[PDB]
mmCIF file of N, CA and C in Angstrom:
data_model
loop_
_atom_site.group_PDB
_atom_site.id
_atom_site.type_symbol
_atom_site.label_atom_id
_atom_site.label_comp_id
_atom_site.label_asym_id
_atom_site.label_seq_id
_atom_site.Cartn_x
_atom_site.Cartn_y
_atom_site.Cartn_z
ATOM 1 N N UNK A 1 15.909 -2.377 -7.724
ATOM 2 C CA UNK A 1 16.925 -1.179 -7.250
ATOM 3 C C UNK A 1 18.150 -1.239 -8.385
ATOM 4 N N UNK A 2 18.260 -1.930 -9.190
ATOM 5 C CA UNK A 2 19.383 -2.263 -10.253
ATOM 6 C C UNK A 2 19.038 -2.925 -11.649
ATOM 7 N N UNK A 3 18.219 -4.047 -11.287
ATOM 8 C CA UNK A 3 17.525 -4.769 -12.642
ATOM 9 C C UNK A 3 16.792 -4.143 -13.119
ATOM 10 N N UNK A 4 15.896 -5.101 -14.064
ATOM 11 C CA UNK A 4 14.421 -4.767 -14.615
ATOM 12 C C UNK A 4 13.326 -3.650 -14.035
ATOM 13 N N UNK A 5 12.752 -4.109 -13.059
ATOM 14 C CA UNK A 5 11.839 -3.374 -12.138
ATOM 15 C C UNK A 5 12.133 -3.654 -10.561
ATOM 16 N N UNK A 6 13.584 -3.162 -10.121
ATOM 17 C CA UNK A 6 14.175 -3.299 -8.924
ATOM 18 C C UNK A 6 15.003 -1.931 -8.647
#
């Protein structure tokens, strides 16, 4: 949602 694959 915000980091790497999120």
